[PDB]
Amino acid sequence: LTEENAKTFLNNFNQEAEDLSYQSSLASWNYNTNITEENAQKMSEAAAKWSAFYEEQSKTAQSFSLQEIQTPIIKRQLQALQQSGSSALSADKNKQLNTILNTMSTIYSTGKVCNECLLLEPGLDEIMATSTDYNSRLWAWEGWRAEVGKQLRPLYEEYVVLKNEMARANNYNDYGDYWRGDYEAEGADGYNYNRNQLIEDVERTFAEIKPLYEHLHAYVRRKLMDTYPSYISPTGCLPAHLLGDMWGRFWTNLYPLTVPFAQKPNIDVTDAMMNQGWDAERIFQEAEKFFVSVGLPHMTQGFWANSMLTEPADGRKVVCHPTAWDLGHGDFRIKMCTKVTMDNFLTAHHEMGHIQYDMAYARQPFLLRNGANEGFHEAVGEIMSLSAATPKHLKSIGLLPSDFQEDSETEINFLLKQALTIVGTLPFTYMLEKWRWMVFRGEIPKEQWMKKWWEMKREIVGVVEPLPHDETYCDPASLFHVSNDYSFIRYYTRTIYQFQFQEALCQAAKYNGSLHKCDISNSTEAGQKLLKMLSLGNSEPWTKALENVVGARNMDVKPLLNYFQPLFDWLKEQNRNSFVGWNTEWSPYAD
Amino acid sequence: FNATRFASVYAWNRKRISNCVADYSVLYNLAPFFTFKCYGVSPTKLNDLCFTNVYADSFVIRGDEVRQIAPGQTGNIADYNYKLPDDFTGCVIAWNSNKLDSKVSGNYNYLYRLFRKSNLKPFERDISTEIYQAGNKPCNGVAGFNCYFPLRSYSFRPTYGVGHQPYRVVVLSFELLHAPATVCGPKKSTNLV
Ligand SMILES: *[C@@H]1O[C@H](CO)[C@@H](O)[C@H](O)[C@H]1NC(C)=O
Ligand SMILES: *[C@@H]1O[C@H](CO)[C@@H](O)[C@H](O)[C@H]1NC(C)=O
Ligand SMILES: [Zn+2]
């Protein structure tokens, strides 16, 4: 049979895929280091050659049988290779699918709505976040919605129709079920995991996430009445433009408005990174010394030679996008606009997690050079910045003396923003995910699109619109991840994954203190607990991955409440004279 | 050491070092020398040992494949490309070779296989290029279902990491068969009184 015959096809595929993927990634990195036509001419042809080679290798793999293979080590690899997608239909479909995606991307990039008027990124949030005027955001919400809604609705409906048509070619129910198929697990009777039952798990997690968010959303409503008396409902919802963002997923600027105690700020290390002689190079040295202290290998010699840490002023076109690029072949490098600020310190500790993750699964072939799912990729970066955010770590670095007096209110106002920047987007994510799960399969027709959208926005998130919108608009398609092909289920799972991994690393180190301030400094036990987790990568599914992390093979909402323990009781003791709930009848436009 | 072209992992050539005096125990020419592990013979006793036949096994492997060249281990190179016997008499010498073999256009000059019908023989030379007939499907020069080409090339790059870099390994394995030795060591202690 083809028991050992499939061992040759995949090893022949990956042998040249490792070569061509690096040829494409090097051109991409060179285009990112300087945006010129000569670099783009080399990047486009490399990307086209790689996309053509992938299809030339996947066109002949469909003839091989899958159910007769016995060794699961290659069954996990072969199921990931047959995911071609647009290879089943003709080229006329792929041409008209891309010629509208490029058109809508160019339209969304050139969004100019006036009647002090700027582009998309220029002056976007600087008016939404910094400006506190009601009339300044009244137009900034309505015009921003109406300039991209009615001009994209006829283009997005045909796109959704094409996405549904693409499901019949690969034997799928809808396009939303295709992104759920990445959380796939096969094996014994206890290792299988269905891709359609994820809605139930998300609902079970949200049913316990809601009691944590109820008091957090009720407390921020009482204090906002000192600025918007005739705009904040007493026992209803809040406006969408009063959330510091056009969508309400990043409540970063709302911290000065919702500060628990304004008599003392949070920790500050920006001034100490200037008078002590700190540069961009010594920060990475201490970060790597903290990473190796748990039992991790050292870095590549070329990581200090080829990585662009300091920003050169010799004529290079800098994009300034902090992201750990995995170029392949074991190459580890970082393209980041590094400075001595704390914002650049958080992302510098975040990218080192991705670097040490990619260093783990470098032994397996290119096909298995990925995570077990879409939630394990960018979840290891946040636990390191969480462990480094403790005041004891900063005191052990050498900036502040050992006589620092850490108070409880400091931890309270730290956890407040740490929750508002992490768990504040969970209802916004769940609402849009349930909306996409309902409208892609065919549960909600096009005749009740916006009505159901607003009903779900009022019920799940608890946000009321200031003016009535009909069903002729296309508001939900105005997001960056909704317009183009971008999955969003990963951000809802990573928030649980990080708090699970942090607690699993803190329990194994025998730390009987606070969980939200637990540190893995000088802990050789958690290092071997994390190496066997990150070493499997895509070879083992998430079921076998979580069993060596915490032991359980299911989503746990217990860490979500066990992390913010001083915050839940604080909000409970501060809401003794407040109404907990929501109203779906109150609206600012109810004249 | 100063060769402009090396062979592959399976098509490596063999040269006999004889009829000349060798300078052993002093061979560090490059800086790193990550691998200088010898088996059975001490590193400081190479000069006072005479030899008659010494073969040089020069092959280019990855970084994670350097540890696989050891008696008693199993991997991807120690079973289908090159493997040392259990009672191996020699030394393994490797260094960093990512400087003079750096080309981003593509490295399709070196070849290596990964499949065979059985295990390797100690000091085996394989240059055949037949189709891998594994199952019960006859192959008559077909590329695809149940028939493939076992020979494939490398993907070396100047930024190949730290544990996967191309390690050009030269095995200094000697043969001793109670033969008249001709390769003598450095003998320089002249002081006349
Ligand atoms: C990218 O563009 C720069 C500027 O012309 C050029 O020096 C460099 O060689 C280019 N890189 C590649 C890979 O073509
Ligand atoms: C590891 O070393 C000591 C342990 O006594 C302490 O400073 C801290 O836990 C760690 N140091 C740093 C710099 O992380
Ligand atoms: Zn995360």
Quickly list DSSP for A404-446: ----HHHHHHHHHHHHHTTGGGHHHHHHHHHHHHHHHHTSS-G
d(CA A437, CA A173): 11
d(CA A403, CA A399): 12
Residue A212's alpha-carbon distances to A424, A472, A558, in angstroms, are 10, 35, 11
The count of residues in chain A is 591
A546-567 burial code (b ≥16 CB/10 A, e <16):
beebbeebebbbebbeebbebb
Picking from B19, B98, B100, B3, the residue whose alpha carbon sits closest to that of residue B58 is B3
Q: Could you tell me the strand order of the sheet in which B167-175 lies? A: B38-39, B90-93, B167-175, B53-61
Q: What percent of the residues of chain B are helix, what percent strand, and what percent coil, each to the nearest 5?
A: 0, 20, 80
Q: What is the DSSP letter of B44?
A: G
**DSSP-H helix ranges across A170-240:** 176-180, 198-223
Q: Return the amino acid letter for A321.
A: H
| Technique used | cryo-EM
d(CA A408, CA A566): 9
Contact B171, B57 (CB under 8 A): yes
Q: Return the amino acid letter for B62.
A: R
Q: Which atom of ligand 2 approaches the CA of A522 most closely?
A: 1
Give the E-state strand segments of chain B in sequence order: 38-39, 53-61, 90-93, 111-113, 151-153, 167-175
Please answer yes or no on whether B159 and A5 come within 8 Å at the CB atom. Answer: no
Q: Which of B130, B139, B157, B165 to mutate against chain A (most A CBs within 10 Å)? A: B157
**Half-sphere exposure at residue B38, Cβ-oriented, CA atoms within 13 angstroms:** 14
Picking from B48, B39, B50, B155, the residue whose alpha carbon sits closest to that of residue B101 is B155
Report residues near ion ligand 3: CB below 5 Å.
Answer: A 379, 382, 494, 498
Token pair belonging to A357: 């993750």
Token pair belonging to B63: 């970084």
Please answer yes or no on whether A329 and B163 come within 8 Å at the CB atom. Answer: no
A376-403 burial code (b ≥16 CB/10 A, e <16):
bbbbbbbbbbbbbbbbebbebbeeeeee
Picking from A202, A247, A207, A199, the residue whose alpha carbon sits closest to that of residue A441 is A199
Kindly report the backbone phi and psi dihedral angles of residue B113, in degrees, each rounded to the nearest multiple of 5, phi listed first. Answer: -105, 165
Degrees, nearest 5: CA angle A360-B69-A367? 35
Which residues are CB-contacts of A445 (< 8 A; sequence separation ≥ 6)? none
Q: How close are the terminal C-alpha atoms of chain B, in Å? A: 40
Q: How far is CA A422 from the centre of its chain?
A: 10
Which residues are CB-contacts of A93 (< 8 A; sequence separation ≥ 6)? A86, A162
Question: B67-74 long-range contacts, Cβ below 8 Å, gap at least 24?
Answer: B69/B169, B69/B171, B71/B39
Residue written as tokens 């071997």? A528
**Half-sphere exposure at residue A585, Cβ-oriented, CA atoms within 13 angstroms:** 2
Token pair belonging to A214: 């109820």
Token pair belonging to A568: 């839940």
Which among A5, A9, A330 has CB closest to B160?
A330
Residue whose CB lies within 8 A of the most ligand 1 atoms, among A36, A37, A42, A316, for a mutation test: A36
Q: At what angle do helices A198-223 and A489-508 cross, to 10 degrees?
A: 90
Q: Is A47 exposed, middle or buried (0-12, 13-18, 19+ CB in 10 A)?
A: middle
Contact B149, B139 (CB under 8 A): no
Token pair belonging to A369: 């050079």
The annotation places the binding site of A at 145, 249, 321-322, 350, 354, 378, 453, 457, 491
Provide the pairing of β-strand B151-153 with B111-113: antiparallel
A326 beta partners: A332
d(CA A239, CA A135): 13
Question: Which of helix, strand or coil describes residue A27?
Answer: helix
Kindly report the backbone phi and psi dihedral angles of residue A300, in degrees, each rounded to the nearest multiple of 5, phi listed first. Answer: -70, 145
d(CA A467, CA A457): 14
Q: Return the amino acid letter for B183.
A: V
d(CA B11, CA B7): 6
Question: Which of helix, strand or coil describes residue A126?
Answer: helix
d(CA A430, CA A335): 32
Which residues are CB-contacts of A549 (< 8 A; sequence separation ≥ 6)? A500, A501, A504, A529, A533
d(CA A253, CA A417): 10
Q: What stretch of H or E contains A328?
A: strand A326-328
Degrees, nearest 5: CA angle B1-B6-B9? 120
Residue B114's alpha-carbon distances to A3, A10, A235, B128, B165, in angstroms, are 16, 12, 70, 13, 19
Question: A487-491 long-range contacts, Cβ below 8 Å, gap at least 24?
Answer: A487/A179, A487/A182, A487/A374, A488/A429, A488/A432, A488/A433, A489/A179, A489/A180, A489/A198, A489/A374, A489/A433, A490/A373, A490/A374, A490/A375, A490/A377, A490/A378, A491/A425, A491/A429
Question: Which of helix, strand or coil describes residue A55?
Answer: helix
d(CA A166, CA A148): 26
Provide the pairing of β-strand B167-175 with B53-61: antiparallel
Q: Return the amino acid letter for B162.
A: V
Q: Residue of the nearest CA to atom 14 in ligand 1?
A: A39
Q: At what angle do helices A489-508 and A380-388 cross, to 10 degrees?
A: 50
Picking from B146, B136, B102, the residue whose alpha carbon sits closest to that of residue A7 is B146
Token pair belonging to A565: 């323990």
Contact A167, A174 (CB under 8 A): yes
d(CA A248, CA A335): 29
Q: Return the amino acid letter for A490.
A: R
Picking from A301, A370, A319, the residue whose alpha carbon sits closest to that of residue A21 is A370
d(CA B10, CA B7): 8
d(CA B23, CA A587): 92
d(CA A138, CA A133): 9
Token pair belonging to B172: 């200094």
Q: Return the amino acid letter for A272.
A: A
Residue written as tokens 């606070």? A514
Question: Which of helix, strand or coil describes residue B152?
Answer: strand
Residue written as tokens 């803190």? A506
Which residues are CB-contacts of B48 (< 8 A; sequence separation ≥ 6)? B185
Question: Which of helix, strand or coil describes residue A13?
Answer: helix
Token pair belonging to A385: 């910045």
d(CA A213, CA A111): 34
Token pair belonging to B107: 């490295």
d(CA A380, CA A351): 9
Scanning every residue of chain A, which has its alpha carbon at the shortest distance from the alpha carbon of B65?
A363
Give the resolution value in Å.
Answer: 3.2
Q: Return the amino acid letter for B26.
A: V
d(CA A165, CA A173): 10
Residue whose CB lies within 8 A of the most ligand 2 atoms, among A394, A517, A522, for a mutation test: A522
Which residues have C-beta atoms less than 6 Å from ligand 1?
Answer: A 27, 30, 34, 36, 38-39, 42
